[PDB]
Enzyme design. Structure first.
Site, mmCIF file in Angstrom:
data_model
loop_
_atom_site.group_PDB
_atom_site.id
_atom_site.type_symbol
_atom_site.label_atom_id
_atom_site.label_comp_id
_atom_site.label_asym_id
_atom_site.label_seq_id
_atom_site.Cartn_x
_atom_site.Cartn_y
_atom_site.Cartn_z
ATOM 1 N N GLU A 140 0.518 -1.598 0.175
ATOM 2 C CA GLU A 140 -0.171 0.274 0.030
ATOM 3 C C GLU A 140 0.534 1.035 0.002
ATOM 4 O OE1 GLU A 140 -2.869 -0.558 3.531
ATOM 5 O OE2 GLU A 140 -3.782 -2.416 1.774
ATOM 6 N N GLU A 249 -4.729 -8.797 -0.050
ATOM 7 C CA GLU A 249 -5.658 -8.681 1.118
ATOM 8 C C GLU A 249 -6.779 -8.572 0.761
ATOM 9 O OE1 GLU A 249 -4.349 -5.957 4.109
ATOM 10 O OE2 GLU A 249 -2.212 -6.270 3.427
#
Length: 509
Positions: A140, A249
């Site tokens: 991220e 995820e």
């Protein structure tokens, strides 16, 4: 091919909040991982594991930024444990993303130089591992432009490839800003390399997976279509042009309602499989697998992930929790089954079958079950009185809890708090009598406005975990919520079954 990666890696699971913890492994809610945890994950049927690692505190000073030898050895130890169990393993750089890599925007030359020196060391140490080990450049990523992001991927990939040997062909996982789907579609540019894998994370709808603002359920036709609309364009742009894709995820983050949770996971993982994307389940150690008890908190949702991850659709029952009130007249109970192509093969109480004909009947389509009232009456203090296991020819079994409940009883329903002695959460002792917490809303009594208007102006409904929670049958209002209180307020704890609630008054002095 993407199909090959899917066959080999789907489904996966994250070792969350472990090597990624800050400042070090064990700093958060998990202790340092034990080897046998990987045996447990293998027993479950996951084909791959993602090992997030936060390197930050173990990185030495400029100019060479040497990684602590004990830390590198530990990361190799855990990675090797996973590889020995024949997992495909994803090794990454994780919370470094916001701890220091986000200085990329303001100090690119120094930050990119540092990240390069870090990736060179990781690449060198893991250069000779099996092709079952994949490198993920950064989790991220933030604090940089889309151009910088693309540059970062290219430069780190070049460093990995330059170490040579097996790193010349090792799969490397790259994404756009924030591992975001929209960034992947619109601002990401694939490096010129035929051994890369693309990635994004998926947590939509955020307020469902987190149980924010009263969004306790999921699964309308619109929601199912929106989910596929989020995923299909990544397939169209990238997968069918030959780029493998990993969803690094996904999963619920506090959502507890059982039917919705099961439906969400079956639907998402099936869509992922359909579009040849490897789904890797997020688990922070408190979400799904209990490493200490060595069992899954929700075995059914795990089995759903394991089957759907192999392209096997799962049947879904409704309701998943059958609530019967103490004293109520008991009538035949209807259970609808979304078969998803499956066939019901039986209904069991543990290993003992219920008798079709007398205990229950099924319609000709085999998707509507009627549990006979006399059967229910035999199955039934408030609580879970029985569990019925619905078995299907293929796919996960469905387990229905038979719950006897009554009106929830609060010892105390009115509380006095001062604005200067607030320290910790407000405990509200309760006898929930078989009911389960769904969500909470808070309203200021004089104005009728939300108690949390200063942060969420449009709704009185609060957010799970950060505002409210249930624990051991007692209800709680978090300190955060108390600090926003100015005058007397009313909190309505909404419970399952729907319509049941407990109202608590809070007086402010």
């Amino acid at each position: 091919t993407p199909a090959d990666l899917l066959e080999n890696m789907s489904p996966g699971w994250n070792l969350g909040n472990t090597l990624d913890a800050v400042p070090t492994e064990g700093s958060w809610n998990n202790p340092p991982v034990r080897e046998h945890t990987f045996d447990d994950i293998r027993d479950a049927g996951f084909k791959s594991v993602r090992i997030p690692v936060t390197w930050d505190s173990h990185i030495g000073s400029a100019p060479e930024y040497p990684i602590d030898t004990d830390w590198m050895n530990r990361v190799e130890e855990v990675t090797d444990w996973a590889l020995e169990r024949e997992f495909y393993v994803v090794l990454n750089i994780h919370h470094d993303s916001w701890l220091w890599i986000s200085r990329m925007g303001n100090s690119q030359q120094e930050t990119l130089d540092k990240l390069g020196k870090v990736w060179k060391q990781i690449a060198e140490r893991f250069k000779n591992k099996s092709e079952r080990l994949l490198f993920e450049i950064v989790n991220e990523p933030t604090g940089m432009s889309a151009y910088q992001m693309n540059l970062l991927n290219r430069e780190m990939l070049n460093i990995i490839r330059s170490t040579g040997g097996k790193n010349g062909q090792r799969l490397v996982i790259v994404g756009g800003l924030e591992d975001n789907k929209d960034e992947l579609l619109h601002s990401f540019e694939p490096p010129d390399d035929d051994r890369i894998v693309l990635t994004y994370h998926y947590y939509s709808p955020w307020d469902y997976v987190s149980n924010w603002w009263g969004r306790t359920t999921w699964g309308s036709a619109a929601e199912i279509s929106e989910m596929e609309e989020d995923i299909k364009p990544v397939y169209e742009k990238f997968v069918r042009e030959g780029y493998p894709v990993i969803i690094g995820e996904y999963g619920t983050l506090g959502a507890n309602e059982k039917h919705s949770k099961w439906l969400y996971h079956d639907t998402f993982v099936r869509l992922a499989h359909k579009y040849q994307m490897v789904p890797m389940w997020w688990d922070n150690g408190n979400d799904q697998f209990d490493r200490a008890e060595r069992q899954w908190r929700d075995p059914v949702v795990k089995e759903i992930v394991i089957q759907a991850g192999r392209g096997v659709p799962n049947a879904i029952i409704k309701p998943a929790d059958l609530f019967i009130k103490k004293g109520q007249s008991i009538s035949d109970q209807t259970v609808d089954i979304q078969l998803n192509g499956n066939v019901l093969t039986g209904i069991y109480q543990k290993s003992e079958p219920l008798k079709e004909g007398s205990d229950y009947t099924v319609d000709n389509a085999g998707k509507t079950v009627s549990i006979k009232a006399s059967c229910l009456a035999k199955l039934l203090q408030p609580g879970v009185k029985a569990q019925l296991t619905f078995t299907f020819h293929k796919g996960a079994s469905q387990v229905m809890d038979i719950i006897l409940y009554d009106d929830p009883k609060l010892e105390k329903s009115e509380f006095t708090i001062s604005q200067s002695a607030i320290s910790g959460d407000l405990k509200i002792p309760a006898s929930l009598n078989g009911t389960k917490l769904a969500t909470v809303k808070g309203v200021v009594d004089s104005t009728g406005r939300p108690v949390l208007e200063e942060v969420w102006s449009w709704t009185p409904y609060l957010n799970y975990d950060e505002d409210f929670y249930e624990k051991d049958g007692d209800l709680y209002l978090k300190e955060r919520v108390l600090k926003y209180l100015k005058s007397d307020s009313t909190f309505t704890f909404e419970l399952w079954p729907k319509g049941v609630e407990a109202v608590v008054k809070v007086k402010i002095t």
